[PDB]
Design a binder for this molecule. Structure first.
Ligand SMILES: [Cl-]
Lengths: 231, 243, 235, 241, 240, 250, 244, 195
């Protein structure tokens, strides 16, 4: 009300309204799902178009051979944060000959987002991210919120109507975690999960976007007729 | 009025309302505690299980500084991480120049002065965490608790977050019933009990217990996480006491 | 007052949303992509008859393979065009090749959100960036001051945009020829313009693989206007 | 009314932020006193440990700035520690640059000048503290110099600070009106501490245990704080006469 | 440094500081530009509230940027000096690096770019100035006349006016200026420029200034008596 | 951790007033009375030592300050603002004058430098004006004896005699009647003590009054012998005993 | 943050005026009147002091008339401290020009430079403008005798006779009435003093209230002399013209 | 660049400057004009290190032309020479100084007098009746000491200059490929096409 003019101001109940307003931009964004087994980790994203003449906005960004994310909210902020992740992954490789741990990647994103919430002039990031990866301790899935809070999960979803997909994954937890050495069945479970967040529209060939990373699988993005198999 | 809109402004009371508002963020967070024992310190924290989809034991909250200091906090988790990152830089520059690892009182003031600096200007926001920290140095065990104002003191027992009153009551009983002192292994068990008792304030969602400790005898004065059998022994002790 | 980079309660940047209102007040620009080329057309909108209309430069070359049309506060576009030209030439210097249309658009869009308290406000102009490269062929992009860009088979921006976009919805198909696309831009411009469309108050351009980016002569556009009138009268 | 939020003049010629910083001074609800002997300067302060969970050894508002200079603060502990760290750095830098130990009055002036800057510059807030500096200066002898959030400072024969400062001040005023001298005519510092505690008891009307007080003593070439057991010895001597 | 965003968007998509700069231009004395077949003429109003002035040493309204290009303006006088200085410096810098004087379009584009920069830079307000930039390109006999404004947009004009009551003189020019046949001679062009100023000025010859620019760096300012002859001839023809 | 106050905090109001300067002048009005009188063979400056507590040692607080050996200063208004100005005034006398010309600045030019510092606090970013008015008395070889007033705006004026602060209106009238161009220094000290008695409420003696002169050269106060040209400081602060002697012949 | 307390000293009003410049001009309208009159054989500068007190040391005092170099002087209306900042900058600019070209600075170039400094404070930096208006009196070998004025906006203009500060409307009407082009310095002296004598808010015009100066090319052997009048010399010229 | 000469007569200043540009083994050009018009009545000739010479000359030219537009006035030769001197005196204590020597020949329209200034790369300025830079002066000053009078005509000045060039063509080792001659007087600057 009077305490939402900038990110440097607490409200009387200890809230940061600019951060909460940034959090709102994510809920307006299109749905994206993340899930994993012990061997692989999968991102599934519902891309959004402006109209029938336009293209569908890309949701998934590759960060390294073993790591990448899906976005929901302001796309330019996802570009800034993914570029930062690309650089940090790259620094780890060049200086230490070491693939960056997914847990450490989350810690770096958290701290980058935080600085924007405590200083005047700047604004919080207006985007949420689902980071998947395969490192020395196996498959990982992270959820990033621009408050700074980063969470490691078996599965999750963010964006509009994301609660539907999140409930499905909460039921399916015991099934999909066991899908080891079978990428197509893990993607099927992700495609079935994102379907619970759909209303009116359905999954078409240029609507759907899938990505996968795993044991002997680099981070690769599937779009177009490459995802027709899963519709 | 308008005195609460900007950080570093004194109200007619002589108060900085923005700092008091940061305390409300701390009061909103999960419960965390600290227990000073005979030759060391024990830290414990309540981690709320928001969903079944959270991976158990993975979202670690307690943080190490140098190799001998443990830090836990309640409130805005990212603000706590920012403070620990600074703490690590302060401990590194101290060790670089003076060789010896940073003493706990010295380390406490480094955090204290940094938090206090974020109450001096309107261009920055105060920290939205209260931080419980400590460890073992040359002069023995030390436990501290640091508030959004920059205020800190030494403690026999410390508690903050939503369950702090419940925890403070339990800690006060231990101080009265053990004047000669508490052992390190005892303090781990008691820390588990206090977090379980303090969970009645956050009783809707089930939770995950996380403990760490520094002790001269049990860990060679280094910060370690309580894991496996010793963690389960502390959970069983806590589960028995509530029933 | 209030921060320049402030979020609203709905999760939008105030200044970006307000710059989009400035773009609605601008003159109309239309782009149509085909397999034979991409056509770019604009409403000139001279404020007075004494203004020499040929000096109104709302369609602009970035490189031989990339053209650009604008709508809104057109003065703001000059530094964006300068950046696009430099980015295009610099990439040719570093890599001995033409720069991709998407990559060029991305470079322009990276400037957009560099504002705060860097420049003091967002850009008050939208761009239609049209071009060709070997990888993805003929392309049309809509570059906003939000930092977002969408690819389009066809797109209208400026004051008559929602009316023009609905018309482009019906008319566009994947088999359109270049000649057909030229007439279609002229048709839709004539529909949304206040003043009567002629060679002096409207301007056409295109980008083909063979001949690159070309702004059309007033004599050439005049013939296409005369061809349009006859074909509409034909039924 | 933004002339009350930052350090600019109000229409009355006042700085409201300075005045409100003075009120923050009493937030701790602690009273301090300082007196001078022949060979020494004594400073006493109330110590209140409300929480049983606190480690009482770490609760203090008296600071050893240098070997010769002690400082007691009336105000919140973060601002007190801010002031303490700066005074320590300034005292050490002075010694390095000019080759002798920073005098008590000169450090007081320096800290007062820094406080003045916060009353003139908008981006810096005043510290909500009053700083009482004590020493046995090698030129001036026993010395008490006090600084406040206005950037004011002055020397003192004796002084008091806190919520009940006026009661302590008048008590001390009346003693020096009788004796007609600027100090406590006493050889040992132990008896000067006993005087300080006695006159605080009389002025506040409360008895003290060993854990209710905190004491600092400046002698020639050192300043030190007393332990709980050292204070107990002082309290026993007061009771026995 | 002072970084404050003074020029910003408002809910309706307007930048008020830029629009309020146009109001400063509206307040300024009237300036007019008319291009003939082989010349350009710049006419300017001098308000007669100020007498006891020293007309030798008072800053003249038309300023030479180079030997072949001139700049007049409407708006804040102090602001105009900053644009004129920057334009003069850029004109010499262009000669130094390109070995050729600036085109009129190039000089206009530079001045316009400076004006635009001040609408999206921190800590600065826009120029309260619109300019008329006129002249001939090197080795070229085609007349050039451009206009700039605080936003930074620029364009070419057959004829144009700016400043106070510019609506009235633009009305006059829109009916009296024929594109198919412009003022063939210097006399015809100066006459049309004086006529257009006589719609607003409401006083004889002391309030009108005229500057004629011809090809190949031939710039001359008319005197009081020379202008007063045009004023006499216009009103004698009008009495009919 | 940024100084973002790069803008003026003193601005013109619609009436043409600079509010913060006026408000600073109001702070000066509340301050204790101080005065200055110029004689033929000297200048005197004086003020009341308003002690904040009787436990406080008022000797340690010096309201009358040496700036150079021949220039002295007194104030009315905010004491801390005065103290930092005296520090800066002493330094600028060296940096912008003595280290260039090998001699101390004349009174008018040192005044000019102090005035400049006070003007800048009236226009620079993120600062308030100084809440003091100064009276600067001095001597130099080519201008002789002089007395200047400096206000929060940075403006300064030369005076034969004047007063500032609490009872300045009454004190200035008293000085208008008594001042003439044939006054000796002792006569000016006598008039200074009479004028100051009117504005003081409580005790009136050498311990509650602070008074200094710019007079003859004092070779006894120099601290060394052997250089004929260096004859000693013209600034001298009168002792507590020296004031009381003149109060008996009052 | 700090935005809350920013007055925004460099913005347009809705009408297209600069708030702070207009308010600075209002300040200057209360300052003591200064008059400049230019003749064929010289220039006069006359100005009224504001603070009449019998105890003000007049012979060593300078609030109105300042020397910029040997050929150029200024009369000040407004804040004296603000004016001295600008005066010292103008003195430096003059000497920089002399060092560079080995010729005394032309009057207009000095005036333009100071006027450009004032302009800057209205367009950028977020600071308040200088609350000063100057009358420049000067000579050079190009234009001869010149009078200019500048104000807080940074605009400057040339004049045959001009007033700044208080009662300018009344002063300018009286000057416009009695000024002629063939006028001489002695006549211009009389005109300056008569104009102040009528426009003054005081009961009578006296020597202790005035600062007076002349720039004549009536020095020995065709040079230019700046005369800043002493108190006794102002008293003599008041008796001569018949005002006291 | 090798030979630059200057001579001030009754009513004009004459500058003579060699046409050769030589790099190492080869004469790259034999028609080089080693001068720039600074203003209508002021001409500067120059010689020194390759690159530096033209860069400095054009930089000065730009600055004087800028001054001329701003003030609508021509600076006196004395004023231009003082500006040039200060630029060179500033240059000599830089990271990389301008290695350029110049002659400035001007006609002062105010005083109705020709003026010749000799300035070296250090910023050493002198006003002279005749001047030269480099090894030229070792031959030409003695000649001019013998034959010069202050009241000479422009034609007499050109004959006296032919006698200088003949001596340099006889006794100097380098072939400087003749001289371009320019006259600066009340009517401006003109080039003597046959010399
Ligand atoms: Cl200091």
């Amino acid at each position: 009300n009077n305490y939402d003019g900038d990110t440097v101001t607490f409200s009387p109940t200890g809230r940061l309204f600019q951060v909460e307003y940034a959090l709102e931009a994510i809920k307006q964004g299109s749905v994206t799902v993340g899930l994993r087994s012990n061997t692989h980790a999968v991102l599934v994203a519902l891309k959004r178009n402006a109209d029938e003449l336009s293209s569908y906005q890309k949701k998934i960004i590759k960060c390294d051979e073993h790591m990448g994310l899906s976005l929901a909210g302001l796309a330019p902020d996802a570009r800034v944060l993914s570029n930062y992740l690309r650089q940090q992954c790259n620094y780890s490789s060049l200086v230490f000959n070491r693939k960056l741990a997914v847990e450490r990647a989350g810690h770096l994103l958290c701290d980058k987002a935080q600085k924007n919430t405590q200083s005047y002039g700047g604004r919080p990031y207006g985007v949420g991210l689902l980071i998947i990866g395969y490192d020395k301790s196996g498959a990982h899935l992270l959820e990033f919120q621009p408050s700074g809070n980063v969470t490691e999960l078996y599965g999750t979803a963010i964006g509009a109507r994301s609660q539907g997909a999140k409930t499905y994954l909460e039921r399916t937890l015991d099934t999909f975690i066991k899908i080891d050495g079978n990428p197509d069945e893990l993607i099927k479970a992700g495609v079935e999960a994102i379907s619970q967040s759909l209303r009116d529209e359905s999954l078409t060939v240029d609507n759907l976007s899938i990505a996968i990373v795993g044991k002997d699988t680099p981070f690769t993005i599937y779009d177009g007729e490459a995802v027709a198999k899963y519709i | 009025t308008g005195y609460d809109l900007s950080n570093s402004v004194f109200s007619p009371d002589g108060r900085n309302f923005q700092v008091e508002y940061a305390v409300k963020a701390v009061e909103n967070g999960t419960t965390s505690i600290g227990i000073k024992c005979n030759d060391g310190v024990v830290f414990a924290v309540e981690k709320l299980i928001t969903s079944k989809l959270l991976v158990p034991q993975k979202n670690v909250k307690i943080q190490v500084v140098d190799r001998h200091i443990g830090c836990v906090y309640s409130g805005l988790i990212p603000d706590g991480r920012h403070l620990v990152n600074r703490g690590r830089e302060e401990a590194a520059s101290f060790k670089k120049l003076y060789k010896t690892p940073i003493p706990i009182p010295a380390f406490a003031d480094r955090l204290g002065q940094y938090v206090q600096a974020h109450t001096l200007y309107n261009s920055v926001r105060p920290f939205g965490v209260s931080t419980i920290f400590g460890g073992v140095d040359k002069n023995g065990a030390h436990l501290y608790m640091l508030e959004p104002s920059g205020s800190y003191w030494g403690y026999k027992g410390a508690a903050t977050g939503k369950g702090r009153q419940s925890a403070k009551a339990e800690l006060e009983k231990l101080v009265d019933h053990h004047p000669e002192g508490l052992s390190a292994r005892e303090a781990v068990k008691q820390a588990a009990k206090i977090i379980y008792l303090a969970h009645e304030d956050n009783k809707e969602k089930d939770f995950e217990l996380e403990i760490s400790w520094c002790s001269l005898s049990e860990t060679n004065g280094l910060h370690k996480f309580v894991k496996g059998d010793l963690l389960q022994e502390a959970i069983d002790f806590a589960q028995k006491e509530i029933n | 007052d209030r921060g320049v980079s402030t979020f609203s309660p709905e999760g939008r940047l105030f200044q970006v949303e307000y710059s989009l209102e400035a773009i609605k007040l601008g003159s109309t620009a239309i782009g149509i992509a085909t397999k034979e080329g991409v056509v770019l057309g604009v409403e000139k909108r001279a404020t007075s008859p004494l203004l020499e209309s040929d000096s109104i430069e709302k369609i602009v070359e970035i490189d031989r393979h990339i053209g650009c049309a604008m709508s809104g506060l057109t003065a703001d576009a000059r530094s964006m065009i300068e950046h696009a030209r430099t980015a295009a030439v610099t990439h040719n210097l570093y890599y001995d090749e033409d720069i991709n249309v998407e990559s060029l658009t991305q470079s322009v869009c990276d400037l957009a959100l560099r504002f705060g308290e860097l420049m003091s406000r967002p850009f008050g102009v939208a761009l239609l960036i049209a071009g060709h490269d070997a990888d993805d062929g003929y392309q049309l992009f809509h570059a906003e001051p939000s930092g977002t860009f969408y690819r389009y088979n066809a797109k209208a921006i400026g004051s008559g945009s929602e009316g023009a976009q609905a018309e482009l919805l019906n008319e566009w198909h994947s088999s359109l020829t270049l000649k057909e696309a030229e007439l279609l831009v002229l048709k839709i411009l004539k529909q949304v313009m206040e003043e009567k469309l002629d060679e002096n108050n409207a301007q056409l351009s295109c980008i083909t693989k063979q001949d690159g980016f070309k702004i059309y002569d007033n004599e050439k556009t005049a013939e296409l206007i005369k061809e349009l009138k006859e074909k509409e009268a034909a039924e | 009314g933004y002339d009350r939020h930052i350090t600019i003049f109000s229409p009355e010629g006042r700085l409201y932020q300075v005045e409100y910083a003075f009120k923050a001074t009493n937030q701790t609800n602690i009273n301090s006193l300082a007196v001078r002997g022949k060979d020494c300067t004594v400073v006493i302060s109330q110590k209140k440990v409300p929480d049983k969970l606190l480690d009482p050894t770490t609760v203090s508002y008296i600071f050893c700035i240098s070997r010769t200079i002690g400082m007691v603060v009336n105000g919140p502990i973060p601002d007190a520690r801010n002031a303490a760290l700066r005074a320590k750095a300034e005292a050490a830098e002075f010694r390095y640059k000019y080759g002798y130990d920073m005098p008590c009055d000169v450090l007081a002036k320096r800290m007062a000048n820094l406080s003045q800057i916060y009353t003139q510059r908008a981006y810096m807030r005043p510290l909500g503290v009053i700083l009482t500096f004590v020493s046995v200066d090698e030129e001036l002898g026993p010395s008490i110099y006090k600084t406040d959030p206005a950037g004011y400072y002055v020397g003192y024969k004796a002084t008091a600070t806190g919520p009940k400062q006026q009661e302590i001040t008048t008590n001390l005023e009346n003693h020096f009106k009788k004796s007609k001298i600027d100090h406590i005519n006493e050889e040992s510092w132990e008896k000067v501490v006993e005087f300080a505690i006695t006159h605080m008891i009389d002025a506040l009307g409360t008895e003290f245990s060993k854990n209710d007080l905190e004491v600092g003593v400046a002698t020639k070439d050192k300043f030190f704080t007393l332990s709980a057991e050292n204070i107990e010895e002082r309290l026993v001597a007061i009771a026995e006469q | 440094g002072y970084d404050r965003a003074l020029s910003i968007f408002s809910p309706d998509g307007h930048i008020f500081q830029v629009e309020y700069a146009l109001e400063a231009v509206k307040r300024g004395t009237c300036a007019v530009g008319v291009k003939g077949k082989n010349c350009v003429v710049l006419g300017c109003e001098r308000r007669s509230t100020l007498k006891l002035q020293d007309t030798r040493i008072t800053p003249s309204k038309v300023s030479k940027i180079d030997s072949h290009v001139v700049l007049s303006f409407s708006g804040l006088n102090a602001d105009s000096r900053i644009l004129i200085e920057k334009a003069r410096v850029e004109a010499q810098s262009h000669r130094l690096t390109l070995e050729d004087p600036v085109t009129v379009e190039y000089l206009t584009r530079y001045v316009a770019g400076v004006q635009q920069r001040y609408t999206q830079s921190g800590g600065v307000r826009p120029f309260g100035v619109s300019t008329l930039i006129a002249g001939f390109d090197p080795r070229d006999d085609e007349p050039k006349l451009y206009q700039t404004e605080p936003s930074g947009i620029y364009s070419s004009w057959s004829a144009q006016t700016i400043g106070r009551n510019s609506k009235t003189v633009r009305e006059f020019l829109e009916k009296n200026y024929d594109r198919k046949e412009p003022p063939a001679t210097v006399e015809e062009c100066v006459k049309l420029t004086v006529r257009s100023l006589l719609e607003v000025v409401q006083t004889g010859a002391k309030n009108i200034e005229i500057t004629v620019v011809k090809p190949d760096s031939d710039i001359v300012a008319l005197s009081s008596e020379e202008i007063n002859q045009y004023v006499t001839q216009i009103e004698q023809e009008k009495q009919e | 951790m940024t100084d973002r106050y790069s803008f003026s905090l003193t601005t013109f109001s619609p009436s043409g007033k600079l509010g913060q300067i006026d408000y600073a002048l109001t702070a000066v009005k509340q301050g204790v009375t101080s005065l200055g009188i110029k004689a033929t063979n000297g200048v005197v400056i004086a003020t009341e030592k308003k002690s904040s507590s009787p436990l406080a040692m008022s000797e340690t607080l010096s309201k009358v300050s040496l700036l150079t050996p021949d220039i002295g200063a007194v104030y009315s208004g905010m004491g801390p603002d005065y103290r930092v100005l005296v520090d800066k005034s002493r330094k600028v006398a060296h940096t912008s004058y003595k280290r260039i010309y090998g001699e101390y600045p004349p009174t008018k030019l040192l005044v000019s430098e102090v005035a400049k510092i006070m003007q800048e606090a009236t226009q620079s970013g993120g600062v308030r004006p100084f809440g003091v008015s100064l009276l600067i008395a001095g001597h130099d070889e080519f201008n002789g004896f002089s007395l200047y007033q400096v206000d929060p705006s940075g403006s300064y004026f030369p005076w034969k005699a004047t007063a500032i602060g609490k009872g300045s209106v009454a004190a200035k009238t008293f000085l208008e009647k008594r001042w003439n161009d044939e006054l000796e220094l002792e006569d000016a000290i006598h008039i200074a003590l009479l004028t100051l008695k009117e504005s003081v409420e409580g005790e009136f003696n050498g311990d509650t009054i602070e008074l200094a002169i710019i007079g003859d050269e004092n070779p006894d106060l120099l601290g060394y012998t052997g250089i004929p040209t260096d004859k000693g400081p013209r600034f001298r602060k009168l002792t507590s005993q020296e004031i009381n002697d003149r109060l008996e012949a009052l | 943050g700090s935005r809350r307390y920013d007055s925004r000293t460099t913005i347009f009003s809705p009408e297209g005026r600069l708030y702070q410049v207009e308010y600075a001009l209002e300040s200057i309208s209360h300052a003591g009147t200064a008059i400049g009159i230019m003749a064929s054989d010289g220039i006069v500068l006359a100005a009224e002091r504001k603070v009449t007190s019998t105890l003000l040391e007049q012979d060593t005092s300078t609030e109105k008339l300042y020397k910029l170099n040997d050929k150029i002087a200024v009369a000040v209306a407004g804040l004296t401290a603000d004016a001295e900042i600008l005066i010292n900058t103008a003195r430096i600019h003059a000497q920089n020009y002399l060092k560079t070209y080995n010729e005394d600075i032309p009057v207009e170039i000095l005036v333009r430079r100071l006027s450009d400094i004032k302009q800057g404070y209205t367009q950028h930096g977020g600071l308040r403008p200088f609350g000063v208006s100057f009358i420049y009196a000067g000579y050079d070998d190009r234009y001869g005798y010149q009078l200019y004025t500048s104000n807080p906006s940074g605009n400057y203009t040339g004049w045959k006779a001009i007033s700044v500060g208080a009662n300018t409307s009344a002063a300018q009407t009286l000057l416009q009435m009695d000024y002629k082009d063939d006028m001489k310095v002695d006549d211009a002296i009389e005109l300056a003093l008569k104009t102040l004598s009528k426009t003054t808010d005081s009961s009578a015009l006296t020597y202790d209230r005035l600062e007076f100066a002349t720039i004549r090319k009536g020095a020995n052997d065709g040079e230019v002399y700046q005369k800043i009048f002493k108190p006794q010399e102002i008293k003599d010229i008041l008796v001569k013209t018949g005002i006291t | 660049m090798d030979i630059i000469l200057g001579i001030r007569v009754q009513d004009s200043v004459i500058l003579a400057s060699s046409k050769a540009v030589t790099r190492g083994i080869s004469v790259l050009k034999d028609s080089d004009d080693k001068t720039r018009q600074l203003s209508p009545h002021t001409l500067m000739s120059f010689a020194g290190e390759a690159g530096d010479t033209v860069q400095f000359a054009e930089y000065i030219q730009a600055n004087i032309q800028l001054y001329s537009i701003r003030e609508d006035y021509e600076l006196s030769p004395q004023a231009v020479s003082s500006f040039v001197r200060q630029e060179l005196a500033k240059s000599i204590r830089s990271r990389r100084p301008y290695q350029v020597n110049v002659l400035i020949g001007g006609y002062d329209k105010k005083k109705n007098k020709p003026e010749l200034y000799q300035i070296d790369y250090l910023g050493t300025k002198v006003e002279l009746p005749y001047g030269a830079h480099g090894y030229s002066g070792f031959y030409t000053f003695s000649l001019l000491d013998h034959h010069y009078r202050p009241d000479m005509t422009t034609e007499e000045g050109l004959d006296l200059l032919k006698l200088c060039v003949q001596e340099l063509e006889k006794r100097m080792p380098m072939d400087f490929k003749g001289v371009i001659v320019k006259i600066v007087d009340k009517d401006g600057i003109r080039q003597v096409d046959d010399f």
